[PDB]
């Protein structure tokens, strides 16, 4: 399914790599993270998972936590303001929010944005 | 086919918009842009036609050519160096080079990168 392209490895060439979605927990301050509300698209890097936004049917969240893969302990990343959007889901038509980690540079926002792109408009 | 998704028209909504496609004269200098030798992909936007990048099998392009949609004119566009990808063709694997407009931001880099990844993974 979701795919970008990386600007890599070497060179000026390029490499298409999975965008790839898990589920996660989200809420409006770091305590409110309870259960899986959110689905969080990450790109495998140098430092490991690399989560760049979460699509959400809630549009008050302003955090995100993940346990790392270790299982050493938990990170709490800051979401930037969502953006929603409508797609005809199996149960019907949903508002779906896209929140960008906070500080995400344009390229990645605008990696997400190209990848998501015909999804949404698919029915 | 290709999407992106638009940032607008208002608020924060997302909207999906058609990446076209459009054959177009490619060339090493301005007066090299001869016959259809490239693909650019294009928006329309406000000014009209806005182009963010061409696809060839050409590895030696710097300049495109654009004849005004009215007919009152032909416009030349610089291409920055290209980036090279391989892609299973009808008449089998293919070296493609994607040449981004000169000056093309990085949210407008990485919708083209992300609109092209599931189409240069098929088969």
């Known amino acids: 399914a979701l795919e970008v392209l990386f600007q890599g490895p070497g060179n000026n060439e390029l490499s298409p790599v999975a965008l790839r979605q898990m589920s996660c927990a989200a809420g409006t ?26 699509l959400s049917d809630l549009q008050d ?8 893969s270790d299982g050493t302990g938990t990170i709490y990343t800051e979401l930037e303001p969502p953006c929603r959007f409508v797609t005809d889901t199996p149960k019907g038509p949903k508002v779906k929010y896209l929140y960008f980690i906070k500080g995400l540079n344009n390229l990645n926002r605008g990696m997400v944005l ?3 792109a015909a999804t949404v408009r698919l029915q």
Chains 1, 2 share one sequence.
């Open 114 to 116: 190209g990848s998501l």
């Open 29 to 54: 301050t770091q305590t409110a993270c309870t259960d899986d509300n959110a689905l969080a698209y990450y790109n495998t890097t140098k430092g490991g998972r690399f989560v760049l936004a979460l």
């Open 61 to 68: 969240l302003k955090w995100a936590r993940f346990p790392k």
